[PDB]
């Protein structure tokens, strides 16, 4: 048995040496030349009140006009962003919703939580009332993030250390992703959809093959749990947010950490992370009741988005990059621009 | 400015808002309780007895008061990342059995640790706790089989039920690191039928009265 441990240690040392050999020049040194982005001023264009409990997740529609938000009050509210109007109000079977997702085509919206089940809702049914389409059971731990890979199949990350890919029409998970020591907390699909990356409480992020069904790379460097993770728009990098009060940028091809976003005055964790359309900005929520805009290339604090009275729980930048909406535990979503 | 169906959509949104407010006002009056403790501490026995793969929700009704009990023992997953969603729970029910000395893998001390963590959690500073010292009946002979010396070498009283039960109650209540913010209600259920729900109702109404006193400024 000890031989396997020695082999694993040798392999880890080889990985460390190989990654060290690649780090010829730090990102900070190469990006020091570029001009820095000035202070970023953003104001709340909309305040989407109506929730009566903590907002735990939100997702934009691909049309950049519709967004959905889930909360402990047990309701999914689909907002018309441009006019603050409610388009739908789905009453959840279980009010312990920890995530939500909006399908690429806008037909389906899904959510899940402590009930261990990913529910799928029809938004364009003939009867006229949004109704649950199928309940994807099979997980053993709370759901932490759902993302619609396609109108017919989605990938879920649970609290039982496993991410699984579901076939909506059939209702069973075709592929199961295992290898996380700790429970998974967030998930993000690549722009090309071929790969997705998940970060867990074991302080490590994994890159998975959606089709092949096996892990490709594991990225470490965080000191604590990774609450949130997001893909860089180019699809060759992703940024993680952890409880140790630092966001960090990982690169798939370089296969090693690339830059860390930390401040001395920032001592609390990160609840959500998102990128701007061009990728030059790395917005990230914090438990100190406000979000900070990070210059993804210089790691400088380019701005701050304060205005929530409680921990910010979720945020996301529209597909056209026009606005960023942040939802917090005070039951208010504010759309900045 | 608004067109015809824009006004229609605004009316639909206002109707949805009215429904949301009505549902929220209905749900605010409901009493939410969190059930904790070891799986073998009689949680299932008490919940099934006192009934009028994830979180299990139980609904009661007593004296025109609606209870919502969230039994979360099935969540074999890391805490501290879903416990914070129970911040607003009115009270926490904690079931501890007095017949766990025999099992060693230290059960009575696991319950002690869990009670300490749940009472001093930063999310439950104000949430009062309701203890249920289960398994009282068979504890009467189990203490005879094994005096309390096996668990509390510092115990100074006599090895009798009337003394040991009180000693355990004080040991549990002392574990509270913050006496003033939250109170602890103790009850020796002994697998009784009607006293469990009645005690839950009494503790809940006392907690609600004190919450209103705090809100209105009398406290």
């Amino acid at each position, epitope marked *: 048995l000890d031989q396997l441990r020695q082999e694993a240690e040798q392999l880890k040392n080889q990985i460390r040496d190989a990654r060290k050999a690649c780090a010829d020049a730090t990102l900070s040194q190469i990006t020091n030349n570029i001009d820095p982005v000035g202070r970023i001023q953003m104001r709340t264009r909309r305040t989407l009140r109506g929730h009566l409990a903590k907002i735990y997740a939100m997702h934009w529609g691909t049309d950049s*006009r*519709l967004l959905v938000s889930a909360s402990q009050d047990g309701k999914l509210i689909i907002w*018309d962003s441009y*006019t603050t*109007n409610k*388009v*739908h109000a789905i009453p959840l079977r279980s009010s312990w919703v920890m995530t939500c997702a909006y399908a690429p085509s*806008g037909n389906y919206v899904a959510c899940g939580g402590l009930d261990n089940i990913c529910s799928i809702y029809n938004l*364009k049914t*003939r*009867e*006229g*009332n949004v109704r649950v389409s199928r309940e994807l059971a099979g997980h053993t731990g709370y759901l932490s993030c759902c993302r619609f890979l396609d109108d017919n199949q989605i990938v879920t990350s649970s609290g039982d250390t496993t991410c699984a890919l579901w076939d909506i029409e059939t209702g069973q998970q075709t592929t199961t992703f295992t290898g996380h020591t700790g429970d998974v907390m967030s998930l993000s699909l690549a722009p090309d959809t071929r790969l997705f990356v998940s970060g867990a409480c074991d302080a490590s992020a994994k890159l998975w093959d959606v089709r092949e069904g096996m892990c490709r790379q594991t990225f470490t460097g965080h000191e604590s749990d990774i609450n949130a993770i997001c893909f860089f728009p180019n699809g060759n990098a992703f940024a993680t947010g952890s409880d140790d009060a630092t966001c960090r940028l990982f690169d798939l091809r370089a296969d090693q950490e690339l830059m860390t976003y930390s401040h001395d005055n920032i001592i609390c964790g990160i609840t959500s992370v998102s990128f701007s359309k061009s990728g030059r900005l790395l917005l990230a929520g914090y438990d100190d009741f406000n979000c900070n805009v990070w210059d993804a290339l210089k790691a400088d604090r380019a701005g701050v988005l304060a205005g929530h009275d409680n921990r910010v729980s979720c945020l996301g930048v529209t597909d056209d990059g026009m606005a960023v909406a942040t939802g917090s535990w005070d039951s208010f979503l504010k759309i900045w621009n | *400015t608004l*067109s*015809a*169906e*824009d*006004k*229609a*959509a605004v*009316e*639909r949104s206002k*109707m949805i808002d009215r429904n949301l407010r009505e549902d929220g006002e209905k749900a605010a009056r409901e009493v939410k309780l969190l059930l904790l403790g070891a799986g073998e501490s009689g949680k299932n026995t008490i919940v099934k007895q006192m009934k009028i793969t994830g979180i299990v929700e139980t609904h009661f009704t007593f004296k025109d008061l609606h209870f919502k009990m969230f039994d979360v023992g099935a969540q074999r997953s890391e805490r501290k990342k879903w416990i914070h969603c129970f911040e607003g729970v009115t009270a926490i029910i904690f079931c501890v059995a007095l017949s766990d000395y025999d099992l060693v893998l230290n059960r009575m001390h696991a319950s002690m640790k869990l009670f300490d963590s749940i009472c001093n959690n930063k999310w439950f500073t104000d949430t009062s706790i309701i203890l249920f010292l289960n398994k009282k009946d068979l504890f009467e002979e189990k203490i005879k089989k094994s005096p309390l010396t096996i668990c509390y070498p510092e115990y100074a009283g006599s090895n009798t039920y009337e003394e040991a039960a009180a000693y355990i109650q004080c040991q549990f209540e002392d574990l509270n690191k913050r006496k003033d913010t939250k109170e602890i209600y103790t009850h020796f259920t002994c697998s009784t039928d009607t006293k469990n729900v009645q005690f839950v109702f009494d503790a809940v109404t006392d907690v609600i009265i004190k919450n209103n006193l705090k809100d209105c400024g009398l406290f």
Partner: single-chain antibody, 232 residues
Framework: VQLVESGGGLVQPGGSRKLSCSAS????????MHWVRQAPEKGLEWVAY????????YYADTVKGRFTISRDDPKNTLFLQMTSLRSEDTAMYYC??????????????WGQGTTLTVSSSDIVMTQATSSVPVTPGESVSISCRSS???????????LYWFLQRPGQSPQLLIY???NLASGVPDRFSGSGSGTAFTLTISRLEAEDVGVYYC?????????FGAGTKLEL
């Protein structure tokens, strides 16, 4: 989804009636409901509208005061109390579905129709040609024009196209003049500009024969076109 309606028959002038619409198979409590009436040989004519929850009620100026529209959501039925009828009130009456929210498709479903026979500022919509012969496999363009541009400030051209198959209630084809209604063969392609609209059919086939009615929705009262009839 199914909308039955009844109450029609022979009525003397100056009488009254209570047309009933029974809604089955959809959430009637959340749908705004219209009453669209078609003369024995003329085009459609909007009559009344009641929103969800009965908050907003409109009547055509031609029938204001005469009729009263009410709904009973628990009973899942829509009522139109009509009194003091005249010779001009003889027409089919269609209970027309309508749901308004961002991206919805109002007027999607139309009732079967009730035959009521009485014993003996508004935007103007004009259709260029009353009838145009057609052949299978050919392309046909139907042209329509309004009085004032329907392109509202928010960018939606509130124009609709309806096809009335011979002997059947009309069904929605195109809403907002560009969006295609669900369930249609997808051959139709509606396009147009402000105050000028047209409907294009590619590879015309059987079952497309009928009368096409345009309808604006920018502001009430809603106005239908005369209608263009396709003949084989």
């Amino acid at each position: 989804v199914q909308l039955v309606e009844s109450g029609g028959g022979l009525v003397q002038p100056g009488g009254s009636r209570k047309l009933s619409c029974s809604a089955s198979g959809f959430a009637f409590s959340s749908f705004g409901m219209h009453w669209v009436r078609q003369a024995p040989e003329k085009g459609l004519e909007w009559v009344a509208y009641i929103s969800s929850g009965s908050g907003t009620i409109y009547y055509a100026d031609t029938v204001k005061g005469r009729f009263t529209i009410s709904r009973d959501d628990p009973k899942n039925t829509l009522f139109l109390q009509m009194t003091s009828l005249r010779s001009e009130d003889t027409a089919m009456y269609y209970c027309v579905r309508s749901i308004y929210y961002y991206g919805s498709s109002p007027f999607d479903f139309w009732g079967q129709g009730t035959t009521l026979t009485v014993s003996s500022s508004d935007i103007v919509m004009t259709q260029a040609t009353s009838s145009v012969p057609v052949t299978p496999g050919e392309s046909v363009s139907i042209s329509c024009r309004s009085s004032k541009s329907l392109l509202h400030s928010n960018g939606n051209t509130y124009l609709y196209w309806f096809l009335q198959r011979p002997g059947q209630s009309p069904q929605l084809l195109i809403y907002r003049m560009s969006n295609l209604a669900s369930g249609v063969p997808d051959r139709f392609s509606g396009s147009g500009s402000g105050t000028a609209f047209t409907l294009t059919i590619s590879r015309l086939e059987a079952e497309d024969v009928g009368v096409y009615y345009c309808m604006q929705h920018l502001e009430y009262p809603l106005t239908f076109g005369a209608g263009t009839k396709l003949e084989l």
